[PDB]
Design a protein around this ligand. Structure first.
Ligand SMILES: CC1(CCC(=O)NCc2nc3ncccc3[nH]2)N=N1
Length: 127
């Protein structure tokens, strides 16, 4: 039931950019979800020890969370918006895969995902 090292948030040789779409992903998308009453389970990697989920990392092999995403955005880790959008979708999908319909954690993810979809719908044109 040990925890893996977190997903990478720093890699100097990896290519990155600062673009208007990525700026929107930080200023609008992340900020909106981060402040939500249901954000707290998703603000850091799943701690399988603390949450007593010893099978978690036997099932979820591409873990993702908003703490990781926040650091990726703030530390200019990404090349493009698609990469960051994929991280959010991974985070939601992991939750749905591991858990059961109507679990509280799933209801929480669904509420965050609703807002995510609304904001991604208005992702600005690349400048
Ligand atoms: C609501 C609950 C208690 C029950 C619980 O641990 N369920 C499993 C679980 N899946 C998760 N996916 C992402 C983040 C946290 C997660 N926890 N406190 N998390």
């Amino acid at each position: 039931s040990m925890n893996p090292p977190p997903p990478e948030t720093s890699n100097p040789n990896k290519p990155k950019r600062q673009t208007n779409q990525l700026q929107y992903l930080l200023r609008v998308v992340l900020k909106t979800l981060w402040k939500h009453q249901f954000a707290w389970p998703f603000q850091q990697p799943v701690d399988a020890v603390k949450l007593n989920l010893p099978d978690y990392y036997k099932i979820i092999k591409t873990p993702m969370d908003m703490g990781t995403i926040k650091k990726r955005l703030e530390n200019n880790y990404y090349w493009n918006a698609q990469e960051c959008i994929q991280d959010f979708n991974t985070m939601f999908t992991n939750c749905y895969i591991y858990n059961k319909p109507g679990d509280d954690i799933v209801l929480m993810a669904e509420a965050l995902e609703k807002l995510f979809l609304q904001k991604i719908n208005e992702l600005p044109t690349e400048e």
